[PDB]
Design a protein around this ligand. Sequence first.
Ligand SMILES: [Ca+2]
Length: 111
Amino acid sequence: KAQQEERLEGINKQFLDDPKYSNDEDLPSKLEAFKVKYMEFDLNGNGDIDIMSLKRMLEKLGVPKTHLELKRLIREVSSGSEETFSYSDFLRMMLGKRSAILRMILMYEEK
Ligand SMILES: [Ca+2]
């Protein structure tokens, strides 16, 4: 919805002021594209990907992980609980070295 998107945009703006990313000339464009994609996931009423949803996706992609294993994984990359993969967690994971820009083709789907 519109509110869900403004929230993510709010987080993007948050990231557009964070120094650890000011050095990326594509950050603005990346954030818009990651926002769109994130909007496609099965999110909870709080706008996050809960661990159960994450487990389902990883199993469907052929890379199964146990509940505990994902908690342990999420805990190390998240700023929130080990039971949620938030949009910001999503961003921190995806962003970084401009060479990581190539990873974005994983989202590409021909129309
Ligand atoms: Ca979390």
